Amino acid sequence: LALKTIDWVAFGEIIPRNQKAVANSLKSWNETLTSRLATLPEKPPAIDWAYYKANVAKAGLVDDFEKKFNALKVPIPEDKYTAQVDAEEKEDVKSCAEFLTQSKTRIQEYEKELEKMRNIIPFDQMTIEDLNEVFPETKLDKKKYPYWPHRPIE
């Protein structure tokens, strides 16, 4: 009977595009079925058994039917979708381990790069070897262009 509450504004930002339209269809299912809950009352009424029977000629049949009705109880339908709890756990380990630890490690890297770039010796105090170590992408590549000036004049 208890259903958890959803804040769609944040929930929207979670779906990978690959499985997106399916999720929108799921949302649609949700609203449809929410309304189709809201409509029908909580519990079907009973029947005026005694008064009704007084209104019937074959009263004994009425009592028979009432009794049997009381006997029959609608089979309680069942769950088969704790597998979604399985998805909870699986995507939990997936996202947590891969994304959330690659995050910590990559952050450690970018942190050390930031440390380096904050304390780069002022260029006035700096030689070309320093720069070649700092931005290796300015290396003149003395092997692919061994001859001077090692960069095509363009």
Cβ–Cβ under 8 Å, residues 134 and 120? yes
How far is Cα 23 from Cα 135, in angstroms, rounded to an integer? Answer: 45
How far is Cα 92 from Cα 83, in angstroms, rounded to an integer? Answer: 14
How far is Cα 8 from Cα 12, in angstroms, rounded to an integer? Answer: 6
Given the rule CB under 8 A, which residues bind other proteins? 1, 3-4, 6-11, 13-15, 23, 26-27, 29-31, 33-38, 40, 42-45, 47, 52, 55-56, 58, 61-62, 65, 69, 72, 74, 76-79, 81, 84-85, 87-88, 91-92, 95-96, 99-100, 103, 106-107, 110-111, 114
| Residue among 29 and 145 whose Cβ is closer to other proteins | 29
| Residue among 75 and 122 whose Cβ is closer to other proteins | 75
Q: Quote the least distance from Cβ 133 to other proteins, whole Å.
A: 23
Cβ–Cβ under 8 Å, residues 15 and 23? yes
